[PDB]
Amino acid sequence: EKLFTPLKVGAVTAPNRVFMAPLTRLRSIEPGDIPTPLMGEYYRQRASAGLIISEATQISAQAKGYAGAPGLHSPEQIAAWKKITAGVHAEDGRIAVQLWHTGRISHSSIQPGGQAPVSASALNANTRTSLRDENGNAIRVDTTTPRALELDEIPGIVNDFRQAVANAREAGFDLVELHSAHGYLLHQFLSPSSNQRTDQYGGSVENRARLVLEVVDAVCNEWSADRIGIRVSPIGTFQNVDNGPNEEADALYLIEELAKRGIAYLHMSETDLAGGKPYSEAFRQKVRERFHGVIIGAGAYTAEKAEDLIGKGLIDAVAFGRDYIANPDLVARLQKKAELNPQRPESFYGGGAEGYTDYPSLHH
Numbered sequence: 618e619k620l621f622t623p624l625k626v627g628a629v630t631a632p633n634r635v636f637m638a639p640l641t642r643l644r645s646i647e648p649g650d651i652p653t654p655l656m657g658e659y660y661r662q663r664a665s666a667g668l669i670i671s672e673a674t675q676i677s678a679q680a681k682g683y684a685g686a687p688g689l690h691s692p693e694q695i696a697a698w699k700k701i702t703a704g705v706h707a708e709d710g711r712i713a714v715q716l717w718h719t720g721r722i723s724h725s726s727i728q729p730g731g732q733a734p735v736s737a738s739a740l741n742a743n744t745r746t747s748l749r750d751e752n753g754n755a756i757r758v759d760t761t762t763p764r765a766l767e768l769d770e771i772p773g774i775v776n777d778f779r780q781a782v783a784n785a786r787e788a789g790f791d792l793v794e795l796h797s798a799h800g801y802l803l804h805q806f807l808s809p810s811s812n813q814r815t816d817q818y819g820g821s822v823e824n825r826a827r828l829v830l831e832v833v834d835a836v837c838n839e840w841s842a843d844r845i846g847i848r849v850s851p852i853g854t855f856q857n858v859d860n861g862p863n864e865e866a867d868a869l870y871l872i873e874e875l876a877k878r879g880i881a882y883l884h885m886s887e888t889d890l891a892g893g894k895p896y897s898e899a900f901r902q903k904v905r906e907r908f909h910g911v912i913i914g915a916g917a918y919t920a921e922k923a924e925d926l927i928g929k930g931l932i933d934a935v936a937f938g939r940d941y942i943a944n945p946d947l948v949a950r951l952q953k954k955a956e957l958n959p960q961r962p963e964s965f966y967g968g969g970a971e972g973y974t975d976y977p978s979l980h981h
């Protein structure tokens with residue numbers, strides 16, 4: 618077993634390789650997109666993780682695409698997150714904040730001014746996002762057609778990432794994870810399917826990767842490269858965003874560029890929940906050749922698959938999603954080969970304590 622051995626992840630040391638994947642749960646307070654004490658309890662319960670990666674969290678109000686997703690842009694949000702990180706640290710845990718801009722996976726009703734959300738191009742996502750009804754319950758609603766960002770608005774987006782990372786540092790997070798996956802704004806620029814721009818932010822892979830690399834450079838300069846992770850989903854299709862006709866080459870280009878910045882980690886979301894073709898060991902080897910920091914894998918991993926690939930030297934850590942929803946002490950359960958609690962997917966999104974903080978540990 619290597620799963621229960623330590624790993625240096627940039628500025629922090631994880632005591633094990635069992636990480637909590639970023640998991641949107643849509644339980645924040647509105648108005649204000651404010652994290653809550655209940656969210657604090659949930660994260661605290663999971664503090665034995667090698668690393669907790671938070672739910673996706675808005676860099677700005679414009680970034681919002683889901684009712685109930687938290688922000689890290691306002692004073693009230695910063696204060697609330699400070700309490701949550703303090704609780705995780707009281708239990709000797711480590712926590713990263715996942716930072717996103719949802720771009721076109723959003724709805725006008727939750728945007729500033731009730732206006733169309735923004736993206737690389739004016740193309741509808743053709744999916745749904747999660748809003749709230751008049752009683753605060755989660756509902757699924759078709760995405761609004763976005764507006765293409767003007768060239769002159771791009772520096773603002775970079776600055777919003779920079780500022781959110783500054784705020785993350787003040788809020789007591791150990792690391793930040795840039796959400797460059799799953800069809801959200803950074804991925805909308807990366808993908809030729811969602812990016813039809815003719816300026817320097819569209820066309821070639823160098824141009825499509827330009828925004829994400831500008832963000833990486835800004836956040837490394839704001840804090841430190843060893844505080845910065847990035848999540849990518851560069852092989853396959855995610856929320857209708859494919860990775861284009863040269864997905865492997867384009868992925869390896871991006872990864873070679875990221876490596877130059879000396880960032881803490883590369884987190885690869887390998888498939889969506891509906892599944893897809895597995896990563897080849899040859900592709901994994903090509904990623905290792907190009908990236909010199911920690912590599913985290915995710916997507917329907919079992920402990921067995923995680924040990925296999927860590928043992929093979931191809932990845933360093935595994936982020937578990939749904940098993941972490943259901944097992945606050947997943948580390949201990951995996952280490953002892955104990956049964957896991959059953960999952961209740963009906964309470965993944967929205968609601969309250971039920972299906973959130975009521976999954977038990979092995980022992981009380």
Ligand SMILES: Cc1cc2nc3c(=O)[nH]c(=O)nc-3n(C[C@H](O)[C@H](O)[C@H](O)COP(=O)(O)O)c2cc1C
Pocket residue numbers: 638639640641642671672673715796798799848886915916917918936937938939940965966
């Ligand atoms: C309810 C739920 C919410 C999710 N929210 C996020 C998110 O906020 N950010 C993200 O990058 N991935 C998100 N994902 C993907 C997970 O991080 C993770 O990659 C996936 O759940 C791993 O597969 P597993 O659940 O089979 O371990 C989410 C998944 C689920 C099931």
